[PDB]
Amino acid sequence: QKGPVPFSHCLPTEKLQRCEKIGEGVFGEVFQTIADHTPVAIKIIAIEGPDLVNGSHQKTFEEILPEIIISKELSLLSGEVCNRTEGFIGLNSVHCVQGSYPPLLLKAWDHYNSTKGSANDRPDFFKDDQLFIVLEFEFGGIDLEQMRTKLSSLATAKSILHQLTASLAVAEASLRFEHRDLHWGNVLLKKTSLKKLHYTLNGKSSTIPSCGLQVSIIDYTLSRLERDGIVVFCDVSMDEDLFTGDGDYQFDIYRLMKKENNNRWGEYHPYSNVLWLHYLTDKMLKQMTFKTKCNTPAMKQIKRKIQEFHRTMLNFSSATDLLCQHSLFK
Ligand SMILES: O=C(Nc1ccc2n[nH]c(-c3ccncc3)c2c1)[C@@H]1CCN(CC(=O)N2CCN(c3ccc(-c4ncccn4)cc3)CC2)C1
């Protein structure tokens, strides 16, 4: 809060030199880099200026605050006691930066455009007065959608669904959280050598077999939480586009959320987390393809249990209810 800092504050030379672009959205850009031998993901969002960026207006600082707040609150659950989870992406730091875009990041941007292609404008039009928010996250891996063909088996699917359900339950209990946009691009996966992952829900600790993967939830655009009756949420009550998509169950979920909440987005309706978990379970059964099919009895029972989850879970009121009551987790 000593005013904006230069890019070099967050990205000193060596850290800048090691940046590779890994993601993007209308919001801006995501780079992976290394510092102290450890990968991090850097999300860079232009704020406060008059230029369209990627077709949209820039957010003001007041408008970017919700993202910052929610990202921090969910990250801090990894250090709490009664409601503890590491299943949200870890937030290392947030800065407000001022300057034109670093040439080294443009070099990385270009490399990505040449190899993967981009929907974004080349971010080379910013002036030396431009402000940005730079969010530094732990590196969370690769999204479930990109891993459509890369997972081992439905046992891995069960671990992912259990991890997601537990994380959402913990956040429900602590923060009256709803993610509200948990499509399969927002579930990150990375290898872990831990066999069991740990969480605590309202003071009761348990474990989840990892199947070698750690899940991290990202992207709080539409998310809602509260502390001491102060609610932070994205008011989409007047959005048209959001409720008119087609071609994927994802777009039904927006409509189903609006039905559940009567188009009142400030309220708490943890059923929305159940809807997203159902959409994810649907992806696991219908769009994911696994290296090893369920060819044995124990594996076959896992398949049947995930199908039973799919068919029953919409009769639960929250992620907390699913976690605590559903047979899949017993
Ligand atoms: O954007 C992506 N990943 C994201 C996003 C946000 C993130 N926030 N935080 C993280 C994060 C990651 C790891 N650890 C911690 C945090 C994010 C990762 C994925 C990877 C890339 N992706 C799709 C993509 O970038 N495409 C590029 C190519 N493409 C495409 C190509 C050309 C055109 C085009 N349009 C107009 C003119 C010319 N070409 C449009 C789209 C569609 C797919 C989804």
CB of 4 shorter than 6 A to ligand 1: no
Q: Which of 121, 129, 181, 282 is catalytic?
A: 181
CATH number at residue 16: 3.30.200.20
CB within 8 Å of 55: residues ≥ 6 apart? 26
What separation in Å is there between the alpha carbon of 169 and the centre of ligand 1? 28
Q: Which phi and psi angles does 27 have, rounded to 5°?
A: -60, -20
The whole-angstrom distance between residue 166's C-alpha and the CA centroid of its chain comes to 15
What separation in Å is there between the alpha carbon of 15 and the centre of ligand 1? 22
CB within 8 Å of 118: residues ≥ 6 apart? 24, 109, 112
State this model's resolution in angstroms: 1.4
Whether 181 is catalytic: yes
Same domain for 2 and 132, yes or no, is: yes
As given in the structure block, the two tokens for residue 118 are: 């981009």
CB of 140 shorter than 6 A to ligand 1: yes
β partners of residue 230:
227
Q: 317 is in which domain, residue-wise? A: 140-330
State yes or no: 181 annotated in a binding site: yes
- One-letter amino acid of 46: A
For residues 286 and 319, the answer to whether their CB atoms sit within 8 Å is no
Kindly report the number of other CB atoms within 10 A of residue 241's CB atom: 8
Same domain for 79 and 189, yes or no, is: no
CB of 43 shorter than 6 A to ligand 1: yes
CA-based nearest residue to 275, from 316, 216, 234: 316
Please tell me the total count of domains within the chain.
2
- Domain end, chosen from 119, 139, 159, is at 139
Q: Which phi and psi angles does 305 have, rounded to 5°?
A: -65, -35
The Cα–Cα gap between 71 and 90 comes to 8
Angle at 238 between CA 237 and CA 241, to 5 degrees: 105
Angle at 246 between CA 89 and CA 241, to 5 degrees: 75
The Cα–Cα gap between 318 and 271 comes to 5
Angle at 88 between CA 86 and CA 89, to 5 degrees: 105
CB of 55 shorter than 6 A to ligand 1: no
CATH number at residue 188: 1.10.510.10
State yes or no: 142 annotated in a binding site: yes
CA-based nearest residue to 319, from 192, 216, 219, 169: 169
Same domain for 51 and 130, yes or no, is: yes
CA-based nearest residue to 163, from 190, 142, 139: 190
For residues 320 and 314, the answer to whether their CB atoms sit within 8 Å is no
CB within 8 Å of 12: residues ≥ 6 apart? none
Same domain for 98 and 162, yes or no, is: no
CB of 144 shorter than 6 A to ligand 1: no
State yes or no: 261 annotated in a binding site: no
State yes or no: 182 annotated in a binding site: yes
What separation in Å is there between the alpha carbon of 145 and the centre of ligand 1? 12
* Atom number in ligand 1 closest to CA 138: 15
For residues 288 and 273, the answer to whether their CB atoms sit within 8 Å is no
DSSP string, 223-268: -EEEETTEEEE---TT-SGGG---SSHHHHHHHHHHHHHTT-TTS-
Same domain for 131 and 27, yes or no, is: yes
Atom 1 of ligand 1 has which residue's CA nearest to it? 23
Residue 1, exposed/middle/buried by CB under 10 A (0-12, 13-18, 19+)? Answer: exposed
Same domain for 321 and 295, yes or no, is: yes
For residues 33 and 15, the answer to whether their CB atoms sit within 8 Å is yes
> What is the torsional sign of CA 45, 47, 51, 56?
positive
As given in the structure block, the two tokens for residue 271 are: 């059923």
β partners of residue 136:
42, 93
The Cα–Cα gap between 261 and 254 comes to 11
Same domain for 101 and 204, yes or no, is: no
- Domain end, chosen from 104, 139, 174, is at 139
CA dihedral 179, 28, 127, 7 (to 10 degrees): 80
What separation in Å is there between the alpha carbon of 24 and the centre of ligand 1? 4
Same domain for 130 and 182, yes or no, is: no
CA-based nearest residue to 222, from 67, 51, 30: 67
For residues 108 and 20, the answer to whether their CB atoms sit within 8 Å is yes
CA-based nearest residue to 171, from 183, 180, 160, 184: 180
Atom 34 of ligand 1 has which residue's CA nearest to it? 119
What separation in Å is there between the alpha carbon of 25 and the centre of ligand 1? 6
Q: What is the DSSP letter of 108?
A: H
- Domain end, chosen from 87, 116, 139, is at 139
Same domain for 147 and 9, yes or no, is: no
CA-based nearest residue to 68, from 49, 43, 85: 43
Same domain for 56 and 187, yes or no, is: no
- One-letter amino acid of 306: I
CB of 137 shorter than 6 A to ligand 1: yes
Same domain for 105 and 174, yes or no, is: no
Same domain for 34 and 87, yes or no, is: yes
